[PDB]
């Protein structure tokens, strides 16, 4: 009858991961929130602010100590004593550590929480640091992507609720179910790649026939995610299907792996 408590916190972020979550088609995010979990704290969506929000945070982590899931969006900055991200007048990292201490497991949503993402790209002005480099004594499931696929986020949630267990993960902590294979291992343009049939400049005859984007800098060959199979926004598209090469956005440090338009090495 009771639903599993979830605390969802936010560090340095753009909020793309919360936005992706609410795009879920099946289950609807509405149904996740009403029926599947108890989303007990979440800055972006919650009624309470300020002292009332602090009261909720403290109440949930105390009452459900050892029993809630901590979802983390964004990441802590280590620069300026952590004050590049301030929450209730104090470094965000303090709230991260408090929330992590009582969690049964942690979900690191997105490339921010998993790896660092854009704020960690050169020269990383704030010393933005992924969660697993700060929290070292808790199960952390990395769900990378900028943001991850909406229906992947919800499928991971439903798996944990339904099966009452964490998903099996690769050596980097990513769920095997969705991150076990590369974009290029399931890309519908592979026929063209293998035939040497490539887009050479935007909107050329090749582009208009859906040829491979390798020479346009596609990072599909080095990127693990579900975009070429599950696709995006209720199966409507994915980056390559709409004509742009994969940026590599699910991979650690993808921002600093050379120009998006330079070919994979």
């Amino acid at each position: 009858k009771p639903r599993i408590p979830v605390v969802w916190i936010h560090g340095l972020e753009c909020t793309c991961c919360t936005e992706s979550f609410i795009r879920s088609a099946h289950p609807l995010a509405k149904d996740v929130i009403l029926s599947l979990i108890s989303l007990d704290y979440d800055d972006t969506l919650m009624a309470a602010a300020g002292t009332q929000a602090e009261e909720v945070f403290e109440d949930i982590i105390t009452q459900y100590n050892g029993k809630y899931i901590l979802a983390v969006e964004g990441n802590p900055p280590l620069g300026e004593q952590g004050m590049f991200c301030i929450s209730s007048g104090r470094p965000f990292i303090e709230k991260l550590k408090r929330a992590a201490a009582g969690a049964s497991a942690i979900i690191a949503w997105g490339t921010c929480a998993s790896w660092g993402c854009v704020q960690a790209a050169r020269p990383n002005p704030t010393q933005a640091t992924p969660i697993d480099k700060v929290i070292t004594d808790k199960p952390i499931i990395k769900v990378p992507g900028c943001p991850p696929i909406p229906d992947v986020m919800s499928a991971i949630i439903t798996y944990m609720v339904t099966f009452d267990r964490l998903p099996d993960v690769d050596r980097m902590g990513r769920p095997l179910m969705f991150y076990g294979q590369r974009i290029h291992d399931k890309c519908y343009r592979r026929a063209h790649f293998d035939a040497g049939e490539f887009v050479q400049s935007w909107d050329d005859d090749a582009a208009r026939k859906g040829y491979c984007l390798y020479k346009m800098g596609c990072k599909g060959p080095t990127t693990y995610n579900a975009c070429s199979s599950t696709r995006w926004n209720d199966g409507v598209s994915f980056p390559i299907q709409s004509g742009h090469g994969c940026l590599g956005c699910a991979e650690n440090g993808f921002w600093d792996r050379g120009s998006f338009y330079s070919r994979v090495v």
């Binding site: 109440d59 007048g89 470094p91 742009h244």
Partner: protein, 581 residues
Amino acid sequence: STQYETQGYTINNAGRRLVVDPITRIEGHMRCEVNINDQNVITNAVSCGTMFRGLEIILQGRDPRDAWAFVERICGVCTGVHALASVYAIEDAIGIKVPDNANIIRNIMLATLWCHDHLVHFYQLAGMDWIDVLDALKADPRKTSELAQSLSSWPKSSPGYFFDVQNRLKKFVEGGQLGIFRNGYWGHPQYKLPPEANLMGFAHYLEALDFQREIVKIHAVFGGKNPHPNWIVGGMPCAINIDESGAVGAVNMERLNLVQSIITRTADFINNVMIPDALAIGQFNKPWSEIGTGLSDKCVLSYGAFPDIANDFGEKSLLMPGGAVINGDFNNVLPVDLVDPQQVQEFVDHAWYRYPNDQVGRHPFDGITDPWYNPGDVKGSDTNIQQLNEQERYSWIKAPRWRGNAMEVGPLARTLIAYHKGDAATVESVDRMMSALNLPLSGIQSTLGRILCRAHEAQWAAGKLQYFFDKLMTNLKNGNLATASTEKWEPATWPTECRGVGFTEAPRGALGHWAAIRDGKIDLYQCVVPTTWNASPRDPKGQIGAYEAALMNTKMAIPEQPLEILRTLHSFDPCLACSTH
């Protein structure tokens, strides 16, 4: 304590200090502090951005063609708008002209964002400031049906439906697991809707949470994915093929059919759910037409947006008007020039940044982003801010000014600019809306007005989606399929040194990206973003920004429960990751 005069306000930090940190139901991290007098009226307001990432620093040395992807991640709520500003800026610097279809598709991307972002803001972000969710449990389902049916033709209005929604809420709350409703402001005297209106609003909150996911399928078709679609310098990567072999690998008739279906459904939802709800909030909350005016009767700013003539950013092309009003002189809408060093300038004397001289403002081509966390004496410590020191540096947000004036940006600002430039559709819409509420025009310059204007804009944008889609189809019927210009794709074709400005109207207001290119790489990249304007800290003259001004003079019923503060702040739709970047 001190007291000084600015912009018709008396800024007085005597009296009780209240802190709201975190501000929730916004994007990102914000802190607000106020002082209240013995009458529980705000006499001082302090706006603080509590995050920074440093995109302007990270962009240095990047390939200009890659820039859009980095700056898109300034914000996942206004997702796409920074990519658009970026491709505009780089194209302006290099001297690139995009094909008509690329421009039309970009306008579709922006209009899609306006619809999506405004819808989610109304329900998921601001909605619970106006709708008492718990009070919905005391509604009569039949009376709720009667109310809904009196306001709209929307089909979903049966008593059984409202009973089902109410029962779901009842079961949700019954075990004590209130989730997002925990420790809310329910029962506050400023909640004025009757129970039936609360149930109707809550049902619509849920409908909107479901429906918003569909709108962004337009971004998925043209841009691959949402959040964070893809773009290119030179146009768009979504090559079109209607009637040739391999159309399966391109934007084809089936893909365009999907887009059309989403446009129709989006307009239907906005016009028949959001619009009547906004008007209803207005009807039950008329006193809020006189609260939170702030700078909206003094200084407002729009750059303008939606160039309908490809590569023409002038007044005859932009469908959303640009202009500035200062000193309450709405009879004289002034032209805005983003290259003019005496116009847009940013100050940091009250922000956590270093300038060689913090008493002067820097135009973004002269911009500096050198972070300097220096809060001074904050009644705690550097890592424990109990009270910001607003006499010195108190925010990660820079302070933009226009010709030295503090400005408000966003839907209300745009509406006022369009109205006073004499845009016929805007004049008709605004006059009709204020007539329906039996309020004078001045009632729009308020917290309630911000909300009404935003809903109006969602309706406008949904209409423009159809207009742009039809323009696209017209070109395709004439055999004009081009989506990218690549003449100047290669760095060897670029000027050795050049600079450009890209500008638009994001959901929250006037957006500019200023870019300087040297030797094939970004030498400087400076952003001034709508919430940077609105959430601005003070300048060397002590002039206050839009949020601080809007909060001034506000009565609070219950000081410890900041509902009035949240109402006014949320009415601006704060995006803090945007403001600080």
